[model samples]
Target: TIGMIALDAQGNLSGACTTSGMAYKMHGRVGDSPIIGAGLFVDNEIGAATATGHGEEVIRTVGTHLVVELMNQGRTPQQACKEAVERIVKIVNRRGKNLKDIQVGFIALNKKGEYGAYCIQDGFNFAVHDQKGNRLETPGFALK
Candidate 1:
C-alpha cells in the first residue's frame, strides 16, 4: 500500500491511496488501503492524512480521520501524527500484541503548508517534494 498527500498552492488539500490488496492471504480482509477515510482522508479546512502498513488496525482506529480531527482541535501536524501513533501503540499494548514487526505509519499535511509523520516503528518512511527540494524522510516513531 502507498499513500500520498498534497497541499497545493491554492490551499487545496488532496490525498490518494492505492493498493493491490493484502499480499497473499487468499484475499483475506482486503486491508484498509482502499477504504474511505481509513487509508486516506482529506479535510481542506484543517489538513489531510494518509496511512500505510497494517490495515486491520488502521480500519479499527479510523486512522486518517483521527489525525485530521486532531489537527482541527489545535494539534500541529507533528503532534497530531504522534498522538495517533500513541493511540495505536496503546491498542497493541492493551491487547498483548508484540510490538515487533507491525508497522502503521501516518503522514499529514495541514493548510499552513506544514507536514509531519509518525509510525509504529522503523521501516516506515516518506518522500518529500516541494519548493525546497526532494528527499526521503524517516519520521519519528512510537515503538522501540
Candidate 2:
C-alpha cells in the first residue's frame, strides 16, 4: 500500500509507500518500494504514481515511471494509469503467461489534483478520505 500526503502548495510533490511485497518469496528479494522509478515516482512538475501487487511485474516494466512520463506527455491520470496496466497485461500475455493469475495495480496523481487508479483484476480496492468520511473505490477498467 502507499500513502500520499503532500503535493506542495508551491508546485512541489511528495510521496510515501509501504508494502510487505510478495510474501515468502526470496530471502534477499527487493521489491519496487525500495526502488525509485518502479514503485513510486514524483516529477513535482509533471505528476506522481505508486504501484502495488506483483512487485516483479511492476519492476520489470518500471511501471510508475512509465505512468508519470505518460502524464508528462499530456495524458490524464486515468489515461496514463490505464495505459500502464495495459502494458503489463500485454507483456504478460506475450510471454505465454496467464493474465488471470497476475495481479497488479497503480494509482496516479497529476499536479492538478487529478487522480486515477487501475488494476489487473477485481477485489482490489482503494479508499478515498476527506473530512466527511472514507469510501472504498474500484477502478472502472477492473477485470470482472
Candidate 3:
C-alpha cells in the first residue's frame, strides 16, 4: 500500500492511497486502501489521514476517518493516531488475540502542518519529504 498527504495551493489538506493488494488475495478481494474513509480521509478545514497494513482491519474500524474525527474532537495529530491504534488493539484483545502477529499503522497531518503517526508494532517505517528534505521514520507504540 502507498499512502501520502498533500496540501494544495488553496491550503486545503488531502490524502491519496494505492495498493496492489496481498499476493494471494482473490480477484474480488478488496480492502480499505481503495475506499475513501477506511484508507484515506480528508477534512479540508482540518487535516488528512492515511493508513496501511491490514486493510480488512482498517476497513472494519474505519481507521483513517477515525483519526480525522478524533482530530476534530480537539485531539492533536499524535494523539489521534495513537488513539486509533489503541482502539484497534483493544478490539483485537477483546477477541482473545494479540497484536504480536497483526500489523497496521496510520499517518496524519493537520492544516497547520503538524504531523504524527502510530503503528501496531515495530518494523513499519515510512519516508517524509518536504522543505527539510526526506527522512525515514518509525512510529511509536506501547504494549498492553
lDDT of 1 by residue, 6-82 (tens): 98889898888888877676745677888777898998899999998788878888889999999999999999999
Tell me the lDDT of candidate 2: 0.80
Go through the candidates in order and give each one's C-alpha lDDT.
Answer: 0.87, 0.80, 0.86
Weakest ten-residue segment in model 1 by summed lDDT: 21-30
Off by over 4 Å in 1: none
Expressed as tens digits, the lDDT of each residue in 15-60 for candidate 2 is 8877776678788888888788888888888899888777788888
Which of the two, 1 or 2, has more lDDT? 1
Kindly report which residue stretches of model 2 are placed more than 4 angstroms away from their true locations once superposed.
3-5, 130-133, 142-144
Clashing pairs in 1: none
What TM-score should be assigned to candidate 1?
0.94
Task: Return the lDDT, model 3, position 144.
Answer: 43
Candidates sorted on TM-score, descending: 1, 3, 2
- lDDT tens digits, residue span 73-133, model 3: 9999989999989998898788787688777678899888888899888777888777789
Q: How large is the C-alpha RMSD of every model relative to the true structure?
A: 1.2, 2.0, 1.4
Relative to the unseen true structure, what is the Cα RMSD of model 1?
1.2
Using TM-score as the measure, the top candidate is: 1
Best by lDDT: 1
Q: TM-score winner between 2 and 3, please give it.
A: 3
